[PDB]
A paper describes a structure:
With the aim to accelerate the diagnostics of this key pathogen, we used the flycode technology to generate nanobodies against the conserved and highly abundant outer membrane protein OmpA. With an estimated 100,000 proteins per cell, OmpA is the most abundant OMP of E. coli and occupies around 6–20% of the bacterial surface alone, depending on the cell size. To gain insights into the binding geometry of Nb01 and Nb39 and to rationalize their specificity and species coverage, we determined crystal structures of Nb01-OmpA-short and Nb39-OmpA-long, both resolved at a resolution of around 2.3 Å.
The structures revealed that both nanobodies bind to the surface-accessible epitope of OmpA, consistent with their ability to recognize OmpA in the cellular context. Nb01 binds with all its three complementary determining regions (CDRs), whereas Nb39 interacts via CDR1 and CDR3 only. The crystal structures of Nb01 and Nb39 revealed that they recognize all four extracellular loops of the respective OmpA isoform, thereby explaining their specificity for OmpA-short and OmpA-long, respectively. Nb01 did not recognize any of the strains carrying the OmpA-long isoform, and conversely, Nb39 did not recognize strains expressing OmpA-short. Genes encoding ompA-short and ompF were amplified from E. coli K-12 MC1061, while OmpA-long was amplified from clinical isolate #11 (CS#11) of IMM. The structure was solved by molecular replacement using Phaser module of Phenix using the OmpA-short model processed by Sculptor66 and the Nb39 model generated by ColabFold.
Author numbering:
A (entry chain A): 2 to 177
B (entry chain B): 5 to 122
The structure:
């Protein structure tokens, strides 16, 4: 049920993205912390237990609403992880993903009727995920996972270093 | 409508005044806060500033005559002017800087007029 030994796969994911430790600006309005996240990924399966995968993630744009100051933060990146899986049944796997993300985060803020700025930064963060994967056909599988990414930013540059959690459904095709 | 100033008008030479400015949201959202002064079409002169940690700085033209302060329970920044010279008449303007990592984001008020008699 894990992809056959020495096989390639490609897939995509959609998810509920939520940022945490979101300190940035002292805005007096709401912040919309739940956002659509998305990504593409591809990988290679070594054996039923071990695979490696790379992907791009869009982590979503968080608005900071307010009438004193308002702004936004967004992040995205490229990740590389090892996937370690246990065949809990002969058709369902449970897995963890371990590795890192090269990320770009962008911020903006403005004062209503006044000044504004845009900034961005780049850096590297650890990625951990856990999930289950079900093989629908020998070619198609679906994933449900939670992906945690730490310190997406720098408080000395863009002014925030939030964490991201993302629950996602993914689908992949296997080139067996 | 972010920084709102009050309390200018006429003062006599050698007299005294208190200006006040209340910000949208909280003092301590900013570092520093300050006062500037402008005569019609001349540059904004920095008058005084006050850091989040409460350190105070002054222009040499007002040092020892004016004093900068706040009251957190009032949410108010004050300029106390004493020993007013005729060279201190201006529109006095409240300033407030948001410090967002490496980025500085300034806020300015319309200002309040101060006029001086001999």
């Amino acid at each position: 049920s894990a992809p056959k030994d020495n096989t390639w796969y490609t897939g995509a994911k959609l998810g509920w993205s939520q940022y945490h430790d979101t300190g940035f600006i002292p805005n007096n309005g709401p912040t919309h912390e739940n956002q659509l996240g998305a990504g593409a990924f591809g990988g290679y399966q070594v054996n039923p237990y071990v695979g490696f995968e790379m992907g791009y993630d869009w982590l979503g744009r968080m608005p900071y609403k307010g009438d004193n100051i308002n702004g936004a933060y967004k992040a995205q990146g490229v990740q590389l992880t090892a996937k370690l899986g246990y065949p809990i049944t002969d058709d369902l796997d449970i897995y963890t993903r371990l590795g890192g993300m090269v990320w770009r985060a962008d911020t903006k803020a403005n004062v209503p009727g006044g000044a504004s700025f845009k900034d961005h930064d780049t850096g590297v963060s650890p990625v951990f995920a856990g999930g289950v994967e079900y093989a629908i056909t020998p070619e198609i599988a679906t994933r449900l996972e939670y992906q945690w990414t730490n310190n997406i930013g720098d408080a000395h540059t863009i002014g925030t270093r939030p964490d991201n959690g993302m629950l996602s459904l993914g689908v992949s095709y296997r080139f067996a | 409508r972010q920084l709102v100033e009050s309390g200018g008008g006429l003062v006599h030479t050698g007299g005294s005044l208190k200006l006040s400015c209340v910000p949208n949201g909280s003092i301590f959202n900013f570092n520093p806060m300050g006062w500037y002064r402008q005569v019609s079409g001349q540059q904004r002169e920095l008058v005084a500033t006050l850091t989040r940690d409460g350190v105070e700085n002054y222009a040499s033209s007002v040092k020892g005559r004016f004093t900068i302060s706040r009251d957190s329970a009032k949410n108010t920044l004050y300029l106390q002017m004493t020993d007013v010279k005729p060279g201190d008449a201006a529109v006095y303007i409240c300033h407030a800087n948001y410090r967002i990592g490496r980025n500085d984001l300034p806020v300015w008020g319309k200002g309040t007029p101060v006029t001086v008699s001999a």
